[PDB]
């Protein structure tokens, strides 16, 4: 049947406990819809049991903020009450960028795995979601993710549901949009959207980008980031690497309105800021406002012009539907929270 697993907010990422082997060792894996290789070895050593089997391949993945390489194995993986015999996983001998986690739970589309194995550079690696579905365990090939805002350093306030949605995690109804035809966003959980600030200020004209649980910030193309900095009055900040607003500019901060699937999603002023009681986690000072809208580092028109990251998904329920090749979004009871 469908099944869920709790997920823990670590401010920059979410993790889930994942068992590997029989008997299972638990690893804390980063929930990533922006990549598709499940791997471990960034902290705990890989504990090899009788369900571990070698493959003929090494594995390597390069990310925006890090990388890993190692050797590919098959093993039994457990997610809550769901078990996947013979899940292909990576085991890192090298990794950078993974402080705070054992590795990644790769729930991006399987096409991202092509090229990661050597010498089999054209071979794909079915994901945990794909295997749960093809083995008959979940009734449709889908993952739905609940994130929520946080005021603690580590809060188990999230959920992954494989094979169904959980109506206790969203309000109103889910809006779907097809995966975009525009490359390279089309290789990820890529959608088309536009962004405006307040009632009258365009930020990002309709274009392609991705929805990524494993990107912290809500990133927008550089030309759109300049428009956002102008519209908010924000300035760069040393100590954080985030934009900063004064007290007055936060009081005047308007919503960002995302148009997706013909519907408006409102990322409020409070949703645009880092949780202020946790400002020291990003090098900031207390009673200061830092923004979670960041610069993607590329101009619009490249076919991947935004990343709706963890900070966006703390305010919206998301549905990653492989069977239908679509992405769904809904409001939640926390969309209008003021806890940051």
């Amino acid at each position: 049947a469908a099944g869920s697993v709790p997920a823990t907010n670590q401010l920059v990422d979410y993790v889930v406990n994942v068992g590997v082997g029989s008997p299972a060792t638990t690893y804390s894996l980063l929930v990533d819809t922006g990549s598709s290789n499940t791997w471990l070895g960034a902290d705990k050593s890989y504990v090899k049991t009788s369900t571990s089997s070698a493959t003929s391949d090494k594995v390597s993945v390069t990310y925006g903020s890090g990388s890993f390489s190692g050797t590919e194995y098959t093993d039994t993986v457990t997610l809550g009450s769901l078990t996947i015999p013979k899940q292909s996983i990576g085991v890192a001998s090298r990794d950078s960028g993974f402080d705070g986690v054992d590795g990644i739970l790769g729930v991006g589309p399987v096409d991202l795995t092509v090229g990661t194995l050597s010498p089999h550079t054209s071979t794909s690696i079915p994901t945990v979601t794909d295997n749960l579905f093809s083995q008959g365990t979940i009734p449709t090939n889908l993952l739905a993710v609940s994130f929520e805002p946080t005021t603690s350093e580590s809060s188990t306030n999230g959920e992954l549901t494989f094979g169904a949605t959980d109506s206790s995690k969203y309000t109103g109804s889910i809006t779907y949009t097809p995966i975009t035809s525009t490359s390279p966003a089309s290789a990820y959980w890529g959608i088309n959207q536009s962004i405006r600030y307040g009632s009258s200020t365009s930020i990002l004209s309709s274009t392609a980008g991705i929805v990524d649980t494993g990107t912290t910030l809500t990133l927008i193309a550089s030309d759109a980031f300049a428009k956002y900095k102008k519209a908010t009055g924000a300035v760069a900040d040393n100590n954080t690497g985030l934009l900063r607003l004064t007290t007055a500019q936060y009081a005047n901060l308007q919503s960002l309105f995302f148009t997706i699937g013909g519907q408006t999603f409102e990322l409020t002023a409070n949703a645009q800021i880092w949780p202020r009681n946790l400002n020291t986690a990003i090098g900031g000072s207390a009673s200061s406002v830092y923004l979670i809208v960041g610069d993607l580092g590329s101009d619009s028109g490249e076919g991947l012009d935004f990343i709706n990251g963890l900070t966006f998904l703390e305010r919206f329920y998301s549905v990653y539907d492989t069977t239908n090749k679509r992405l769904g979004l809904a409001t939640t009871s926390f969309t209008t929270a003021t806890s940051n």
């Binding site: 920059v12 990422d13 980063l30 929930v31 990533d32 819809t33 922006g34 990549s35 598709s36 290789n37 993945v61 390069t62 990310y63 925006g64 903020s65 890090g66 960028g97 990644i104 991006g108 991202l112 990524d212 649980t213 494993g214 990107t215 912290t216 910030l217 990133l219 990003i282 990343i307």
Partner: peptide
């Protein structure tokens, strides 16, 4: 933060 497989 992080930016996960550009």
């Amino acid at each position: 933060x992080v930016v996960x497989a550009x």
